[PDB]
DNA sequence: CATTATCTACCGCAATATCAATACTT
DNA sequence: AAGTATTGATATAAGTAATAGATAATG
């Protein structure tokens, strides 16, 4: 009877936010008119109600004007005014939706968008208008679908969305009113006055105007309060009832909320290919894996939640809670006669203080929001439906509270189902606690010994979390370590450990799954043994080895008396070098690795605050070590990069009849595409964006049009193909492992590389994951990718220059001259493309006579395809057929040998 | 008695970094005669002069020959130009120094502590007669240096703590048209407003006679500049240049608030003033409508306003009780929530 | 040949007003 | 031919002159 009770709440929790908000603060008006005249945050809800009640007549009047203007049908004599002209632009859109719903949508979106976009006390007007328009169109779609189901353009242009958003935002600005108190400096007399709540203004940054909306400090004073949850309600939140399993890409996840399987940000090609794959039916395994991930139950850790609530109510700055502060602390202004360098330093300090203060406020607000959700979901069981991104990795549909969040969100989550520890449950819980404390190179027995060494500390930290030694704070994952300490205290209370029913998920992870895939694909013995694919006696740490190498490099380079080298000679650490290497193998840049290492070492503060200069040399040493360390992965990613270049710099032969004629070179519209081992189609979304000044009521925003067809960003394709391929393989392995575990009946959820389950079923899960990795990687995926590209891009021609003096080039020159007289006009590369295309069309004719005659015809590219040495030999522009490079040689290494490995996932 | 360099020596130089120099001694003599610097400085024999971005050094050599100052200093950072100047002016009383005039720390080191060049402070009533600063900012990519120097005119901090010092500026013609603008002209901007508020300027020379239409007719007929041709500047590829004379004047307003109000008010420079006020802050439109009794000022665009009206509006802005703070006016790109 | 931005992957962010030329309809 | 809307170009602020580290495009 638990499902039916939760079913009613979810239908209530899936109620329209616009209807609830209409009823919510309308109710809050009743107590205000009864209790008395006040300005508490309940009166903030009252102010929102008053804003709605005064804004509704203006929207009604605008609808009346548009309806009365659209009645006539002669556009020349109608709407001579500029304002009345745009009425034909937008009016047929506004009449669809209830004006009250429209008003509440505008108010809620404006409240939600505050302190966003780099504005101190507001949001950029372009974001505000486009977001209001998008919310209105989504509400329109929901209403249309619901009424169509009840009774038994299609895509709104971004220009119309921006126009509607600006109209409504301005019309609310003209209405919103709030009272502020202040003194005048003539007489130092304290006075009161009311002002509009919002004021549209402009700002500058490096010589550029930013149309910004501004929200009054009086409004912010209440929007900071904990009643923000009451004033604004989330739309997507964790579910109590079992999610509907993934079958159709247009129907799944939430019971009443439609979502797509892929998170296609700004491209329709990925949507089209995913829809084609769904219609064909090649992603049933993906459906099964997503259902397994999204079918597990969770509940909030009550004791850890109580501890977090007490720490937050204290108000002091905890490990990750920023704390509570009310006003900024700005240093005294320097004298106006001081040097411009001093003035610039003071302005930089002011900017830094404002940045830190805003970031701390945002952290506090997010933590308060998270705790409010946790309190609203205390005790009950919660479900996480899972979506997928284009590159293939899984994410939930609850952005606010999820296990992919920070340490607090993870520690506040446990499995609703409990399973007995059995013979190995206590051992694996102790392993998990050892994992949470940053020690991993030690074997399982040593981990158990480390956990056994600190029973008294565990008992203290569990009997009294605060007001004690607080050993859980000095852990890399504090809240999860606290939950683990709680459960070990409970089991040590019992005389028989193997009878305790537990709820704590155990962390099992594969260190650098990308490196594992490199070693597996290349068949490299050295990489496999370094990454523990080969069975060994103890886990081996690639991060530790490369960190020792970087220590050697810095010892060599310290002879220059460098302060950074002297300090970090004995301070190079596993964490910094690991954060550098994990992304580096993925293809990070020098500046990216510098950013990561500086970010990780900045809290240590061993060097100066401006450690970028030092981290430059540190990254240089790291790259110098990695170049010698890794070769097979480097070769594989180079083959991927060469393939990316060839695919990007290619033109199909079916583009047109004559040419695009847009410049000498037709635009490039070729993106790298292939198929995951589970049948999902991966498409790189990278493209160019064309942003045009779109006029609106408030101002002329600077937005693009994602529906327009644009060229492909070659640099982004090159940078994205390798990591996208690697992580698609990783997520496919994760999906297969999840599907098999769900078939076996385990409770399975995962965050990318790491896999979560109870301590009793960890061995079965480990066996399942080894088997699934073997099954997925038994095939030569690099070769299969080569044939996939060959079949997908067989009729493609490159573009390149050629020597004027090449003997074959003069033949191409004559064929150009020959083509000119045959076509009757000047010869072009586009004419060559058309001639090649029609020749392939001739081969498509089933008539054998036309085929031989078609084979008799000679085309410029047709000369190249007969040739086999012009590309190697390589002015004038020439057309080269798309010849992808040969795959790098594959070393000899048996895949199945890792089945006996112990520290593959640990 | 310093050796004036020639066109053949100028052509030998390789890198100019966009800087263009006038090289005609006759035109320089005419310019100096028009300036008549001896009128302002009754005793230029003891005068000390500093040069920013000297370059060829023709102007420095001609100035020293004509006036015989006491101590003359040059600050050049370009490498080839530095070797050229050092090689040419060896064994001469004229001084050459290697320092970059872009960095404020260079000025602080030169005047404050090391004290190679020690100017004397004068009163603010009259132009300092013992300090002359001549600079060349003809480079196309360094107008920000000129605007920062005008802000230093306003703030009385960088080099103007010594008082009112005259500035002779070789600087591009486009920035000259923007800077020397008058109310109502299409080239009116914050350059012109700052110039009007903090100094008085007179055009002294121009490179192309075609560009004189952009300026004001009364102003050009008053100044009577010395028109020359593009031949007399060695690098001919660049845009035409202009020479201006900057004289600091006394001002009575609060620089920070005036700066804020002008910058925010004049963004919509072609909007009637009865509409542009609401962007100053919340309720600014109502407040300024209440406090502005004149109905002739409420229909003039900010491009048509002058420094007096801008100072008046600054005064009303300060008398505003509910004024937004001017320090919290920026966007922080470092901060971004960017939640997943 | 110097310049010129450009920098792992994702997971709901990076400009605007004004003025001149041109072509389009009337 | 004379308006008139469209399309394109240009200035704004005023130390990212806050990297050779490494490099693929540019004109
Ligand atoms: O703590 C982070 C984080 O909460 C938030 N944040 C910033 N960028 C992102 C993002 O791309 N995706 C998500 N989910 N969250 C984001 O802002 C805070 C930034 O503070 P930090 O100084 O700790 O992070 P920083 O950007 O400096 O380093 P990094 O995010 O590149 O690693």
Residue numbers in the entry:
A (entry chain A): 407 to 558, 589 to 1310, 1320 to 1351
B (entry chain B): 2 to 341
Publication text:
Mitochondrial RNAP (mtRNAP) is essential for mitochondrial DNA transcription and replication in eukaryotes. Mitochondria recruit a single-subunit RNAP and one or two auxiliary factors to initiate transcription. Here we provide a comprehensive, stepwise mechanism of transcription initiation by solving high-resolution cryogenic electron microscopy (cryo-EM) structures of yeast mitochondrial RNAP and the transcription factor Mtf1 catalysing two- to eight-nucleotide RNA synthesis at single-nucleotide addition steps. The Mtf1 is positioned on the top of the polymerase cleft like a lid.
